[PDB]
Amino acid sequence: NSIAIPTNFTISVTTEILPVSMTKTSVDCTMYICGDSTECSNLLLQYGSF
Amino acid sequence: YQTSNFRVQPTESIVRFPNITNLCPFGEVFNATRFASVYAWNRKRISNC
Ligand SMILES: *[C@@H]1O[C@H](CO[C@@H]2O[C@@H](C)[C@@H](O)[C@@H](O)[C@@H]2O)[C@@H](O[C@@H]2O[C@H](CO)[C@@H](O[C@@H]3O[C@H](CO)[C@@H](O)[C@H](O)[C@@H]3O)[C@H](O)[C@H]2NC(C)=O)[C@H](O)[C@H]1NC(C)=O
């Protein structure tokens, strides 16, 4: 025989973090890689599918 | 539905360098009263202007 029961208690309301979203950066290809450069975008469009 | 970006560039860009030269007196070297001989050609620098 033995047990353990709390005579009283506490309401230990604490923190909790669940990171929801991020920066949904829609990083393009023809400008991020190729800023004001027809040459870079020309070379990258044959990569394409990437 | 995502269509495209737009890589705008109004009035292109501006090229800027500092104010006019300082300690570049080319006249007194090129309009000089005192020149040099050919085998004794002078050698003087221009710098920081
Ligand atoms: C269980 O604990 C509570 C409070 O405990 C306190 O708070 C928790 C969240 C934790 O942080 C604990 O570490 C912390 O001690 C007890 O409540 C207390 O009850 C007594 C009476 O039973 C209150 O006394 C009052 O005093 C005024 C003065 O005028 C009277 O008018 C009231 O009528 C009353 O008698 C006391 O304020 C209260 N809070 C405390 C002590 O912080 C609870 O009694 C306890 N359970 C058992 C079974 O002991």
Task: Confirm or reject: Cβ of A38 under 6 Å from ligand 1.
Answer: no
Identify which of A34, A35, A32 has the alpha carbon closest to the alpha carbon of residue B9. A35
Q: Which two tokens stand for residue B31?
A: 């309009």
The residue among B7, B3, B8, B10 whose CA lies nearest residue A30 is: B7
- Alpha-carbon span B7 to B5, nearest angstrom: 7
How far CA B3 is from CA of A28, A29, B36, in Å, comes to: 11, 13, 70
CA distance A10 to B38: 101
Question: B5 and A28 in contact by Cβ < 8 A?
Answer: yes
Rounded CA-CA distance A49/A46 in Å is 8
Write the DSSP symbol of residue A41.
H
**Angstrom resolution of this structure:** 4.7
Q: In this structure, what are the phi and psi dihedrals at residue B31, rounded to the nearest 5 degrees? A: -100, 30
CB-based contact B7:B29 (threshold 8 Å): no
On whether the CB atoms of residues B4 and A29 are closer than 8 A, the answer is no
Method: cryo-EM
Ligand 1 atom nearest the C-alpha of A7 is: 48
Torsion angle of C-alpha atoms B27, B30, B31, B34, degrees rounded to 10: 120
